[PDB]
Design a protein around this ligand. Structure first.
Ligand code: IIU
Ligand code: MG
Ligand code: ZN
Length: 313
């Protein structure tokens, strides 16, 4: 009850910043997550024993893939922590509870393959979930783990509060399907510009949380350059393995996933910054002004990819 997690001084200070990198010491990541729940939510939000058991079963259900792994889960949860801590009074008690868990769980049991690849392979998951295939699976794995004996971290919530938190988690996890991000961001653009955006309107809050989820999910482009550039290698290690698997089904993959087209990566990163990342953080910054550092860091990385193209690195 009187038992805080504390971090060494460098981590205690830097964990508060958006560009924080959780480090290569896997055994410190559970403690970093508990630290973030305790400061974001409270020491009372969850029974410590249940939370620790939940975290460790979540870890066990992430796979040893190059990018969509336990380190990504915790990294996406830290970006949500930073957003929440910089927007103290905008979010409900249930939202603070749900969103860190949603982020920890958002890629549960990812195999390193896109929704597209599952549909072309004709994976059983693509017949069970026709759109947002992996994201409905991630939500299903989250409910599975919440239902294991001793793993119900929400046990103190009423029936209707429990239903509300699981609904916040479902929508937050579905929103990490980047196919749904383009339309969500356009509606948020129109709503903000015509002044109709209303944070008491639940369907509006849902949209804003969806955009927060995209921003956290993509937060590798908001790190200091050496972190962003080394993370890119892990992202492409998966894309290129998917490319190989498309070639095995007799399908020329898109260039993004074709290892023969490594040379075109810098221009590919430019498209992604310009079509996805910058717009994401720009709209987030308009809605939630204290998230501006995410946008500033993204623009710094865009300018580094521009330097790569110009052979200045
Ligand atoms: C799983 C989602 C995800 C994706 C990315 C990412 O880097 N995306 C993207 C987008 C689009 N192209 N096009 C290319 C490309 C095009 C032609 C030739 C070679 C390459 N390369 C990417 C890379 C970053 C993060 Cl943080 N999460
Ligand atoms: Mg995902
Ligand atoms: Zn993710």
């Amino acid at each position: 009850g009187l038992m805080q997690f504390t971090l060494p001084v460098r981590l205690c200070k830097e964990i508060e910043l958006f560009h924080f990198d959780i480090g290569p010491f896997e055994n410190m990541w559970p403690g970093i997550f508990v630290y973030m729940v305790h400061r974001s939510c409270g020491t009372s939000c969850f029974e410590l024993e249940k939370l620790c058991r939940f975290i460790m079963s979540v870890k066990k259900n992430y796979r040893r893939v190059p990018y969509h792994n336990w380190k990504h889960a915790v990294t996406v949860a830290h970006c949500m922590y930073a957003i929440l801590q910089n927007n103290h009074t905008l979010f409900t008690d249930l939202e603070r509870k749900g969103l860190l868990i949603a982020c920890l769980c958002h890629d549960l049991d990812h195999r390193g393959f896109s929704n597209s690849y599952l549909q072309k392979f004709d994976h059983p998951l693509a017949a069970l979930y026709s759109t947002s295939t992996m994201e409905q699976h991630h939500f299903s794995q989250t409910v599975s783990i919440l239902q294991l004996e001793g793993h119900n971290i929400f046990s103190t919530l009423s029936s209707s509060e429990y239903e509300q938190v699981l609904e916040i988690i479902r929508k937050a996890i579905i929103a990490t399907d980047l196919a749904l991000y383009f339309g969500n961001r356009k509606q948020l653009e129109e709503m903000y510009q015509t002044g109709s955006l209303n944070l008491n309107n639940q369907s509006h809050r849902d949209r804003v949380i969806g955009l927060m989820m995209t921003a956290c999910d993509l937060c590798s482009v908001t790190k200091l350059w050496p972190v962003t550039k080394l993370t890119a290698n892990d992202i492409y290690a998966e894309f290129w393995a998917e490319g190989d698997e498309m070639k095995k089904l007799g399908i020329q993959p898109i260039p993004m996933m074709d290892r023969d087209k490594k040379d075109e990566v810098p221009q590919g990163q430019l498209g992604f910054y310009n079509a996805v990342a910058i717009p994401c953080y720009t709209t987030l910054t308009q809605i939630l002004p204290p998230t501006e550092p995410l946008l500033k860091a993204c623009r710094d990385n865009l300018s580094q990819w521009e330097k790569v193209i110009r052979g200045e690195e």
